[PDB]
Design a binder for this molecule. Structure first.
Ligand SMILES: CCCCCCCCCCCCCCCCCC(=O)OC[C@H](COP(=O)([O-])OCC(O)COP(=O)([O-])OC[C@@H](COC(=O)CCCCCCCCCCCCCCCCC)OC(=O)CCCCCCCCCCCCCCCCC)OC(=O)CCCCCCCCCCCCCCCCC
Ligand SMILES: CCCCCCCCCCCCCCCC(=O)OC[C@H](COP(=O)(O)O)OC(=O)CCCCCCCCCCCCCCC
Ligand SMILES: CCCCCCCCCCCCO[C@@H]1O[C@H](CO)[C@@H](O[C@H]2O[C@H](CO)[C@@H](O)[C@H](O)[C@H]2O)[C@H](O)[C@H]1O
Ligand SMILES: COCCOCCOCCOc1ccc(C(C)(C)CC(C)(C)C)cc1
Ligand SMILES: COCCOCCOCCOc1ccc(C(C)(C)CC(C)(C)C)cc1
Lengths: 55, 68
Protein backbone atom coordinates (compact mmCIF):
# COMPACT_ATOMS: atom_id res chain seq x y z
CA UNK A 1 0.00 0.00 0.00
CA UNK A 2 2.87 2.42 0.63
CA UNK A 3 3.77 2.13 -3.04
CA UNK A 4 0.36 3.57 -3.94
CA UNK A 5 0.81 6.23 -1.27
CA UNK A 6 4.22 7.31 -2.54
CA UNK A 7 3.03 7.37 -6.16
CA UNK A 8 0.06 9.57 -5.27
CA UNK A 9 2.24 11.79 -3.09
CA UNK A 10 4.85 12.43 -5.76
CA UNK A 11 2.28 12.90 -8.52
CA UNK A 12 0.48 15.51 -6.43
CA UNK A 13 3.87 17.03 -5.63
CA UNK A 14 4.79 17.42 -9.30
CA UNK A 15 1.37 18.89 -10.12
CA UNK A 16 1.66 21.41 -7.29
CA UNK A 17 5.23 22.30 -8.26
CA UNK A 18 4.38 23.04 -11.88
CA UNK A 19 1.15 24.90 -11.11
CA UNK A 20 2.39 27.07 -8.25
CA UNK A 21 5.71 27.97 -9.85
CA UNK A 22 4.03 28.94 -13.13
CA UNK A 23 1.38 30.96 -11.31
CA UNK A 24 3.86 32.79 -9.08
CA UNK A 25 6.18 33.60 -11.97
CA UNK A 26 3.31 34.93 -14.08
CA UNK A 27 2.05 36.99 -11.14
CA UNK A 28 5.45 38.62 -10.61
CA UNK A 29 5.60 39.32 -14.33
CA UNK A 30 2.20 40.98 -14.29
CA UNK A 31 3.04 43.16 -11.29
CA UNK A 32 6.28 44.29 -12.93
CA UNK A 33 4.43 45.11 -16.14
CA UNK A 34 1.87 47.10 -14.16
CA UNK A 35 4.66 49.11 -12.56
CA UNK A 36 6.27 49.77 -15.92
CA UNK A 37 3.03 50.59 -17.72
CA UNK A 38 2.28 53.13 -15.00
CA UNK A 39 5.89 54.42 -15.33
CA UNK A 40 6.77 54.54 -19.03
CA UNK A 41 10.31 55.72 -18.31
CA UNK A 42 10.79 52.10 -17.23
CA UNK A 43 8.62 50.49 -19.96
CA UNK A 44 11.79 49.61 -21.86
CA UNK A 45 13.64 46.34 -22.42
CA UNK A 46 15.62 47.14 -19.32
CA UNK A 47 17.39 43.79 -18.89
CA UNK A 48 17.55 43.07 -22.61
CA UNK A 49 15.55 41.38 -25.34
CA UNK A 50 17.50 38.10 -25.24
CA UNK A 51 19.23 38.23 -21.85
CA UNK A 52 16.12 37.90 -19.71
CA UNK A 53 14.63 35.35 -22.09
CA UNK A 54 17.74 33.17 -22.10
CA UNK A 55 18.03 33.39 -18.32
CA UNK B 1 6.96 91.85 -80.65
CA UNK B 2 9.40 94.07 -78.75
CA UNK B 3 12.02 96.38 -80.30
CA UNK B 4 15.71 95.66 -80.43
CA UNK B 5 16.35 98.53 -78.03
CA UNK B 6 14.31 96.78 -75.35
CA UNK B 7 16.02 93.48 -76.08
CA UNK B 8 19.59 94.81 -75.98
CA UNK B 9 18.85 97.06 -72.99
CA UNK B 10 19.76 100.41 -74.56
CA UNK B 11 18.29 102.81 -77.09
CA UNK B 12 21.46 104.28 -78.61
CA UNK B 13 24.57 103.56 -76.53
CA UNK B 14 25.50 100.54 -74.44
CA UNK B 15 26.57 101.81 -71.06
CA UNK B 16 29.52 100.26 -69.21
CA UNK B 17 28.68 98.22 -66.13
CA UNK B 18 31.02 98.37 -63.17
CA UNK B 19 32.32 94.81 -62.61
CA UNK B 20 31.90 92.97 -59.34
CA UNK B 21 34.45 93.39 -56.58
CA UNK B 22 36.48 90.34 -55.58
CA UNK B 23 38.20 91.07 -52.23
CA UNK B 24 41.49 89.31 -52.95
CA UNK B 25 42.81 87.14 -50.16
CA UNK B 26 39.49 85.82 -48.87
CA UNK B 27 36.41 83.93 -49.94
CA UNK B 28 33.45 85.64 -51.64
CA UNK B 29 30.56 86.47 -49.32
CA UNK B 30 27.21 86.19 -51.09
CA UNK B 31 23.86 84.60 -50.36
CA UNK B 32 25.06 81.55 -52.30
CA UNK B 33 28.51 81.49 -50.63
CA UNK B 34 27.41 80.45 -47.14
CA UNK B 35 27.99 76.69 -47.17
CA UNK B 36 31.68 77.57 -46.79
CA UNK B 37 30.85 78.74 -43.24
CA UNK B 38 27.74 76.67 -42.42
CA UNK B 39 27.74 73.05 -43.55
CA UNK B 40 25.00 70.57 -42.78
CA UNK B 41 24.98 69.44 -39.12
CA UNK B 42 27.55 66.69 -38.68
CA UNK B 43 29.01 67.04 -35.16
CA UNK B 44 26.14 66.10 -32.82
CA UNK B 45 24.20 63.45 -34.74
CA UNK B 46 24.66 60.66 -32.20
CA UNK B 47 23.72 63.06 -29.44
CA UNK B 48 20.68 63.81 -31.58
CA UNK B 49 19.69 60.15 -31.57
CA UNK B 50 20.16 59.87 -27.81
CA UNK B 51 18.34 63.11 -27.01
CA UNK B 52 15.42 62.23 -29.29
CA UNK B 53 15.06 58.92 -27.45
CA UNK B 54 15.21 60.59 -24.04
CA UNK B 55 12.81 63.35 -25.09
CA UNK B 56 10.25 60.86 -26.39
CA UNK B 57 10.56 58.75 -23.26
CA UNK B 58 10.33 61.58 -20.71
CA UNK B 59 7.42 63.17 -22.57
CA UNK B 60 5.61 59.83 -22.69
CA UNK B 61 6.20 59.32 -18.97
CA UNK B 62 4.83 62.68 -17.91
CA UNK B 63 1.92 62.47 -20.36
CA UNK B 64 0.89 59.06 -19.03
CA UNK B 65 1.17 60.28 -15.44
CA UNK B 66 -0.93 63.36 -16.23
CA UNK B 67 -3.57 61.30 -18.03
CA UNK B 68 -3.75 58.70 -15.27
C1 LIG C 1 12.26 56.61 -41.86
C2 LIG C 1 11.59 57.83 -42.49
C3 LIG C 1 12.57 58.53 -43.43
C4 LIG C 1 13.35 57.48 -44.21
C5 LIG C 1 14.00 58.14 -45.43
C6 LIG C 1 14.20 59.64 -45.18
C7 LIG C 1 15.50 59.86 -44.41
O1 LIG C 1 15.92 59.01 -43.71
O2 LIG C 1 16.21 61.05 -44.57
C8 LIG C 1 17.10 61.34 -43.53
C9 LIG C 1 16.47 62.32 -42.54
C10 LIG C 1 17.42 63.49 -42.31
O3 LIG C 1 18.67 63.04 -41.87
P1 LIG C 1 19.07 63.21 -40.28
O4 LIG C 1 19.99 64.39 -40.10
O5 LIG C 1 19.77 61.98 -39.77
O6 LIG C 1 17.72 63.43 -39.37
C11 LIG C 1 17.90 63.25 -38.00
C12 LIG C 1 17.20 61.97 -37.58
O7 LIG C 1 15.83 62.11 -37.81
C13 LIG C 1 17.43 61.75 -36.09
O8 LIG C 1 16.85 60.55 -35.71
P2 LIG C 1 17.67 59.14 -35.93
O9 LIG C 1 17.25 58.51 -37.23
O10 LIG C 1 19.16 59.38 -35.95
O11 LIG C 1 17.30 58.15 -34.67
C14 LIG C 1 16.15 58.47 -33.94
C15 LIG C 1 15.56 57.23 -33.27
C16 LIG C 1 14.69 57.65 -32.09
O12 LIG C 1 14.47 56.56 -31.24
C17 LIG C 1 13.25 56.62 -30.55
O13 LIG C 1 13.25 56.82 -29.38
C18 LIG C 1 11.93 56.36 -31.26
C19 LIG C 1 11.28 55.13 -30.63
C20 LIG C 1 10.22 54.55 -31.56
C21 LIG C 1 9.56 53.35 -30.89
O14 LIG C 1 14.77 56.53 -34.18
C22 LIG C 1 15.41 55.49 -34.86
O15 LIG C 1 16.56 55.57 -35.13
C23 LIG C 1 14.67 54.21 -35.24
C24 LIG C 1 13.28 54.13 -34.60
C25 LIG C 1 12.20 54.54 -35.61
C26 LIG C 1 12.31 56.03 -35.92
O16 LIG C 1 16.24 61.64 -41.34
C27 LIG C 1 14.98 61.04 -41.28
O17 LIG C 1 14.05 61.56 -41.79
C28 LIG C 1 14.81 59.69 -40.57
C29 LIG C 1 14.30 59.93 -39.15
C30 LIG C 1 12.97 60.68 -39.14
C31 LIG C 1 12.14 60.18 -37.96
C32 LIG C 1 10.92 61.08 -37.75
C33 LIG C 1 10.27 61.41 -39.09
C34 LIG C 1 8.93 62.11 -38.84
C1 LIG D 1 17.15 78.36 -41.49
C2 LIG D 1 18.49 78.77 -42.14
C3 LIG D 1 18.75 77.89 -43.39
C4 LIG D 1 20.01 77.02 -43.15
C5 LIG D 1 20.67 76.66 -44.51
C6 LIG D 1 22.17 76.32 -44.31
C7 LIG D 1 23.05 77.06 -45.33
O1 LIG D 1 24.05 77.60 -44.97
O2 LIG D 1 22.71 77.07 -46.70
C8 LIG D 1 23.29 76.02 -47.45
C9 LIG D 1 22.15 75.29 -48.16
C10 LIG D 1 22.67 74.29 -49.21
O3 LIG D 1 24.05 74.05 -49.01
P1 LIG D 1 24.93 73.30 -50.21
O4 LIG D 1 25.90 74.27 -50.82
O5 LIG D 1 25.70 72.15 -49.61
O6 LIG D 1 24.00 72.78 -51.29
O7 LIG D 1 21.26 76.26 -48.68
C11 LIG D 1 21.77 77.27 -49.55
O8 LIG D 1 22.67 77.05 -50.29
C12 LIG D 1 21.22 78.73 -49.48
C13 LIG D 1 20.37 78.93 -48.22
C14 LIG D 1 19.73 80.34 -48.29
C15 LIG D 1 18.90 80.63 -47.05
C16 LIG D 1 19.79 81.28 -45.98
C17 LIG D 1 18.98 81.48 -44.68
C1 LIG E 1 5.03 87.30 -76.61
C2 LIG E 1 3.66 87.85 -76.84
C3 LIG E 1 3.66 89.35 -76.90
C4 LIG E 1 3.98 89.96 -75.56
C5 LIG E 1 5.36 90.53 -75.63
C6 LIG E 1 5.80 91.27 -74.41
C7 LIG E 1 6.00 90.30 -73.28
C8 LIG E 1 6.62 91.04 -72.15
C9 LIG E 1 6.80 90.17 -70.94
C10 LIG E 1 8.24 89.73 -70.85
C11 LIG E 1 9.04 90.80 -70.19
C12 LIG E 1 10.49 90.50 -70.04
O1 LIG E 1 11.04 91.67 -69.50
C13 LIG E 1 12.40 91.68 -69.53
O2 LIG E 1 12.84 92.23 -68.30
C14 LIG E 1 14.24 92.22 -68.23
C15 LIG E 1 14.66 92.43 -66.80
O3 LIG E 1 14.83 91.19 -66.28
C16 LIG E 1 14.83 93.23 -69.24
O4 LIG E 1 16.24 93.19 -69.15
C17 LIG E 1 16.92 94.31 -69.61
O5 LIG E 1 17.41 95.06 -68.53
C18 LIG E 1 18.47 94.46 -67.84
C19 LIG E 1 18.79 95.24 -66.57
O6 LIG E 1 17.69 95.94 -66.15
C20 LIG E 1 19.70 94.38 -68.74
O7 LIG E 1 20.76 93.88 -68.03
C21 LIG E 1 19.33 93.43 -69.90
O8 LIG E 1 20.35 93.32 -70.80
C22 LIG E 1 18.02 93.86 -70.60
O9 LIG E 1 17.49 92.80 -71.29
C23 LIG E 1 14.42 92.72 -70.63
O10 LIG E 1 14.85 93.58 -71.60
C24 LIG E 1 12.88 92.55 -70.69
O11 LIG E 1 12.56 91.93 -71.87
C1 LIG F 1 19.69 86.54 -37.26
O1 LIG F 1 20.75 85.63 -37.14
C2 LIG F 1 21.97 86.20 -36.77
C3 LIG F 1 23.06 85.75 -37.74
O2 LIG F 1 24.29 86.24 -37.30
C4 LIG F 1 25.40 85.82 -38.05
C5 LIG F 1 26.64 85.84 -37.15
O3 LIG F 1 27.77 86.14 -37.92
C6 LIG F 1 28.96 86.22 -37.19
C7 LIG F 1 29.99 85.33 -37.89
O4 LIG F 1 31.24 85.47 -37.26
C8 LIG F 1 32.28 84.65 -37.74
C9 LIG F 1 33.49 85.22 -38.06
C10 LIG F 1 34.54 84.44 -38.52
C11 LIG F 1 34.41 83.06 -38.67
C12 LIG F 1 35.62 82.24 -39.18
C13 LIG F 1 36.47 83.04 -40.17
C14 LIG F 1 36.42 82.05 -37.87
C15 LIG F 1 35.11 80.88 -39.77
C16 LIG F 1 35.97 79.92 -40.64
C17 LIG F 1 37.38 79.55 -40.17
C18 LIG F 1 35.20 78.60 -40.59
C19 LIG F 1 35.96 80.29 -42.13
C20 LIG F 1 33.19 82.49 -38.31
C21 LIG F 1 32.14 83.28 -37.86
C1 LIG G 1 23.18 79.51 -42.22
O1 LIG G 1 23.93 80.69 -42.13
C2 LIG G 1 23.34 81.68 -41.34
C3 LIG G 1 24.43 82.59 -40.78
O2 LIG G 1 25.44 82.80 -41.73
C4 LIG G 1 26.56 83.44 -41.21
C5 LIG G 1 27.68 83.56 -42.25
O3 LIG G 1 28.76 84.19 -41.63
C6 LIG G 1 29.94 84.26 -42.37
C7 LIG G 1 30.59 85.60 -42.03
O4 LIG G 1 31.59 85.92 -42.96
C8 LIG G 1 32.73 86.47 -42.36
C9 LIG G 1 33.80 85.66 -42.04
C10 LIG G 1 34.92 86.21 -41.43
C11 LIG G 1 34.98 87.57 -41.13
C12 LIG G 1 36.25 88.14 -40.45
C13 LIG G 1 36.13 89.62 -40.08
C14 LIG G 1 36.33 87.37 -39.13
C15 LIG G 1 37.42 87.83 -41.43
C16 LIG G 1 38.81 88.51 -41.32
C17 LIG G 1 39.50 88.52 -39.95
C18 LIG G 1 39.71 87.67 -42.23
C19 LIG G 1 38.85 89.91 -41.94
C20 LIG G 1 33.89 88.37 -41.46
C21 LIG G 1 32.77 87.82 -42.06
Amino acid sequence: MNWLYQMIYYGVRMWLVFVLHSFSLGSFGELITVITDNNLIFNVFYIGLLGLGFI
Amino acid sequence: PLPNAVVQGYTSVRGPKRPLDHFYGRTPLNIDTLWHWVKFPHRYDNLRFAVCFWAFLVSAHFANKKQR
